[PDB]
């Protein structure tokens, strides 16, 4: 039931459909959350128009189901985006990434003298809506950074 404007086949049984991802984001989300390292059928649509959502982005992973845990972690890059639960062609569910309280294994603490870089542990940051931006606080070194300076993998 997508839309209309010159046909092309594109519909799947079960799986997830992250929708309304802002420009130059669909690629990032694909890399960070390794949402591509799978045997499942994926169909990324980049830049495809959507009214107010002028140049939106789209990702569809077949047979793959996210979790309140995962979905929320998207609120850090594509907050407005909407995650649609498609089971048997029918859109059985529909959520929206809300700010999670802690991101794990993804980012890397910008503090170079952080014990987390040397030892065999997984990174972790407490998320906080500071003022203009989101502040990230390392569980270990306890320093906080604008969610913008923090890098990842």
């Amino acid at each position: 039931m997508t839309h209309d404007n010159k046909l092309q086949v594109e519909a799947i049984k079960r799986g997830t459909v992250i929708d309304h991802i802002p420009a130059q984001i669909g690629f990032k989300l694909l890399s960070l959350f390794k949402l591509t390292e799978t045997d499942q059928r994926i169909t990324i649509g980049l830049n495809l128009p959507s009214g107010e959502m002028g140049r939106k982005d789209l990702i569809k992973i077949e047979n793959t189901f996210l979790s309140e845990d995962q979905v929320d972690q998207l609120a850090l890059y594509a907050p407005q985006a909407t995650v649609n639960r498609i089971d048997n062609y029918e859109v059985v569910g529909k959520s929206r990434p809300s700010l999670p309280e802690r991101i794990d294994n993804v980012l890397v603490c910008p503090n170079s003298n952080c014990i987390s870089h040397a030892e065999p542990v997984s990174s972790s940051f407490a998320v906080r809506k500071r003022a203009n931006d989101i502040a990230l606080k390392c569980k270990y070194c306890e320093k906080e950074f604008s969610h913008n300076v923090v890098l990842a993998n």
């Binding site: 503090n111 003298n113 070194c141 306890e142 906080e144």
Partner: protein, 310 residues
Amino acid sequence: ANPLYQKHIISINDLSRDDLNLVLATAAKLKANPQPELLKHKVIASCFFEASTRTRLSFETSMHRLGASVVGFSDSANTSLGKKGETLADTISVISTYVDAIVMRHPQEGAARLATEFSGNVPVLNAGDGSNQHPTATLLDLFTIQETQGRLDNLHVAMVGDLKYGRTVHSLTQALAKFDGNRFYFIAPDALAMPQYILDMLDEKGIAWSLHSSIEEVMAEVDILYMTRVQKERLDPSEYANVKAQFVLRASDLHNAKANMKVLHPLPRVDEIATDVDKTPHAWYFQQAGNGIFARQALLALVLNRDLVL
């Protein structure tokens, strides 16, 4: 079981005004009537991967004052971690199967936090982790502060020096922010200014703070003048301009000093506090040092002993 029993003591950010008041009250009872065998049969690991004179020696003296035994190292050079490439995680893994509690100082931020993740049931007491926290120092500062001011609420506190790298001021500033009406005055060079996260925490709780270019600019309205050393060993090359102390405290500077105001310093001091201050009734850093014994005995008693000391 008292609140802090078997509890890890990593950051003052994890404790509450209650946990602190408890430690201090206990500190005062133990100073009054010593308990020589309270920790009889306990073996504590004293693991310092970074230099120390007061923290380690006071800590270890405290363990003995309470009848406990001490094992450990004062330098990582001869540990297997130092010569065989062993990770800190594995070190704390095997160590935690020998002793009842672990006290550790380390050069990297978060080291103590990391230990709690591999220490099993054994508690970890942070004796200093890089430029992050230093809980037991703060615990003795508060003890000393209350001992000299009568209270910990509504105080005019000035912290001079390296606030950026001073793990002591990080902890202490968070501690006093748990009490009411404390007025803060930060006097540090621009490159070594108090970190943002601390200032934000201050704003949120509506605490009042202000920056000042000189000691004299606040000498008349401060109860506690908390002097710190420039963390030379932690500075980046691009900050070597601040290796020497910009604010040196001299006796003459204590003329317009409030009679009750004491001067504190977590130590060691280099040249930021001239020796003449040593014999003025305001100097209190050596008394302060001595209090580390009571604050550290108190802390150990609560973590390794179930019942609130009788």
